[model samples]
Target: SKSTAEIRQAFLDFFHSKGHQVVASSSLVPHNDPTLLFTNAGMNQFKDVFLGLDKRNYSRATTSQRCVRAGGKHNDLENVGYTARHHTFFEMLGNFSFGDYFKLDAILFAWLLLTSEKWFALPKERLWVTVYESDDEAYEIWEKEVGIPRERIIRIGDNKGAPYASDNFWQMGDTGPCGPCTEIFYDHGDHIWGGPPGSPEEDGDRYIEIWNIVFMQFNRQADGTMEPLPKPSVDTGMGLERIAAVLQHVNSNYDIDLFRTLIQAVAKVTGATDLSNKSLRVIADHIRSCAFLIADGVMPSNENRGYVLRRIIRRAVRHGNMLGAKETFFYKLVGPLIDVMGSAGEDLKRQQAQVEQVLKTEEEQFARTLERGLALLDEELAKLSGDTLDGETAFRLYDTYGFPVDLTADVCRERNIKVDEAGFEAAMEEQRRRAREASGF
Candidate 1:
C-alpha cells in the first residue's frame, strides 16, 4: 500500500512517464484573474493558454495543484464538516493535453493509470462512469477502448437539448472554455447506496468521484453562443484526498494520513472522546486552510481574502472554546501541519515561521475580544427571559462588544435559548443603510 504522500507522487510520476511535462503547482491565490477570489481548479493557470492568448512550450502537462474552493462561485464552506469528502484546501492531481490528445488518449491514460496493478490497482467491477448523454464519442471510448461494461456507464442529460449543466457539462464561469465532461467514480460497497452512476439515491460519498476528464471543445460566448475552438484540449482533475481515502481503505478523508496528523494534534489539546468530535475535525480542517492561505501572501484582516481568513480563524477559535480549551492554541497546530504538508509544496515550509506568528497574534486578539463579548453577553442574558434574546439586544452585543452573531447563537443554543437571527440581520441592514445616508452628505 502506498502512503498518502507516495500515492500523490506516484500519479504525477506516472503522468511524467507518459510524456506529459510536469509543472510545479500554482498558488491558491490566482494571479491577475479578477473573476475569482481563489483558484478553484488545476486548469486556472492554463486559462489563457486555452483562450489562445498565451502559449506554453509543451503541449501536455501534469500538476498537483493546491486549490481552495471555500468562497466565491465554487464555495464548499458549508459542506466541509458534515461529510467525509469536502475540504476547503485540497490538492488537485491533474493531466492536461493542449491540442496534443483527445478522448481516446485521455480515457486510455485514466483507465490504465487507475486500474494498473503497478499503479492505483482499483477494482474494475466497482468502477463506474458518467458521460454527457450526447457524448457518444466518449461513451464509445469508455465501452470499447476502456472495456468497461455498458451497464456500469450512465448517460446523464439527453442530447435533444442541453445536458444537466451541473453534472456532465463543464463551464468555468458565465462565459469561457465550455464542454462536456466524463466523471469516474469508485464504488466502495453495496451497503452504501444507489444502482448505477446517475441513480436518484446515488450517494456521491459512497460512489466517490475520484477523477473527471473534461473535454474543452468550445468557447461559450457571453450571449449564449457556442464558438468551437480550433484546438480542442483535454483537462482532468482528480482529488488526491479522495483517492487517498479510497486507497487507504478509509471512508472519511480525515482518516487519511495527512489530515489524521492534524486531527491527532487536535485531540491532544481538545480532549476529544470516542463519541464523535466535530470541533476536532473543524480545527484540523481550518488549520491546514489557514497555513496555505497565509503562505500564499494572504493575511488576517477585514476584507476579501483577509476577511475569509479571519472568519476561518475565529470559527476555529469558537470551536476550540467548544472543546473547553481556550487561549491561543491553534498556533501549535501550524508546526504539525507543515510536518504533514511541507513536502507537498515548499511554500508552507518557507513561510512556516510567519504563519505561526500570524496565527498566534490573531488567536490572542480574538481570545480577548471573545472574553469581553462573553462578559457583555452574560449581562444581557441575565436581564433577558423566556428563552429568547431579542433582536436589538443581540444586535447591541454584536455591534458594541464586537461579538460575532454566531458566537451568541452558540452560547444561546447551549442555554436552551434562541437567538433572533432574522432580527440580527435586520438590525445589521439598518445599520449599513443609516451609515450610507450619513456618508452621502
Candidate 2:
C-alpha cells in the first residue's frame, strides 16, 4: 500500500477537502504551563474552541499535533515495547467541530473513514462500535443511522470485539470538555494470549484501540462540578502509527516498516544474548521512544522533562550492555529510525546531524557510566557476603547508583538471592503518585 507519509497526507487532505482549516502545530508546552505538562490530546490547542471563547477564524480546524508524555498525566513509558499498544512522541490526528457539529455527523464520518474500502479496505464484520451504557442516544444513532448490525454494534459487554470501555470515555484533564466516546478496535490475533475472548484486559493477544470519536458536550469545572456548554462539540483522534500498522496488517507496531530496520540493526550490532523476549521487546520500544524524543526538541538533562529523556537513554544503554552487546549501540540505531520515521516530523528530519551528535556523545558517556555501574554492583555484592542486604541498600543502588530496578533485579537474579520487591514498589508508587499532582488526578 501507500507509504506512511502518503497516509498522513491523505488524512489532512481529506479534512481540508471538508472545508476544515489545516493549521500549523503549536509549541510543545512545559508542565507548569497552567494547563498541562505534555500535550496529552490533539484537542489541547483548541481549549477555547470548546469554551466558545476562541475567535471564529475557522469554525472547523484540523492538525497533526506532536505530543510527549514521558512525564506527567499520560506517562506509560514502563510499558512501551513490552505490549503491543503503547507509544511516546506519537502524532494525534484531530478534527474539532468547536460549537459547530455534534454527534450525528461525527458518527457518520467515523464509519466512512473506517469502512471505506478504497481508503482503508477494512472488513465490515470485524468492525465494532461502543457507546456509554447509559447513553441510549449514541446507541440508537449507531444502529439506526450507521447501520451497524445489532450484534456488531455492541453495548459494552463480554465478547470477541465488544468495544465499549471506561477507557473510551473522553475527558479533557480535570476541568474541561468531556463526554461519552466511541472507539474502534483492531483484532491483533488471539494466539498470543491463547485465552478465550473473555480475557482481553489480561490478554495481550485480542485487540488494540485504533481510533476514538469523542463528543465533547460538557464542562467539568475546577470546583468539582459539571455543566453543559453553550454549544456541543466533537473531537476525534486516530492513533496515526497504530492506524498505519492496522492498515498495513502487521504483527506488532515494531514489526511495521517504521521500526523493522532499527530492530534488525540492533540484532546486527549488539547480537547480545540474554535479553529475554519481553526485555528485548521493551528495549526496542524504548529505543524508538528515545530516537523520537531526541529527534524532536527534547533533550537529556538532570531535571524535569530532560531528566526523563536522559533516563530513557541511559536505561536503553544499560540494557544493551547487560545483554552483552558492543558498546555505543545507541548511536547505531538512530539512522534506522530516521530511515523509517524521518518523514513524520520535519524538524526531526532536518536535525539529523544534531540528533546523531547528541546520541554519540551520550553513548560514550553512558558507556563509561555503564562500566562504573558494573563496578558499583560488584562492590555491593562483595560487601553483601558479610551482611544481609536491606530495602534501603537496594534503594540506594537504584536511586543513587543509577541501577534501574529491573537491572537491580537482574543483578539479584544472577546471585540466586532475593530482592525487596515490596519495598521497591512502595517507593516507586509514592514517587509516581507524586508526579500525578500536575495531572490533577
C-alpha RMSD by candidate, in order = 3.5, 6.1
Q: Give one digit per residue, the lDDT tens place, for model 1 in 1-441.
A: 667789889999999999999999889887688877887888888987777777899999999989888787677765777677788888899999998989899998999999998778988998999998889999999999888899988888843364336578877765677688999998878666555566766655678888999999888776768888778899899999999988998777888888877788887766666425767877888887888899998998878999888878887887887787744689888778878874675798888889989998998888867767777778888888788898887798767765667657766876788998899999999999999999995
lDDT of 2 by residue, 1-441 (tens): 656666677778878887789986564653334757667778888877787777668888888876765666577665665566677667777777877777888887767766787556677766667776666888899899978787655454323243322555676676777777877766666554533223446346356667788888777777747788778888988877777777777756666666565566676667854333444555666666676667656787767666677777777776676666765677777666667764465656676778878877876766655677677767777778643345665666766666656556655654665667778777777767878976784
lDDT of each: 0.83, 0.68
In Å, residue 51's CA in model 2 sits off its true spot by: 2.9
Q: List candidate 2 stretches off by more than 4 Å.
A: 27-32, 156-165, 190-203, 272-281, 371-390, 404-441
Q: What TM-score would every model get versus the actual structure?
A: 0.89, 0.81
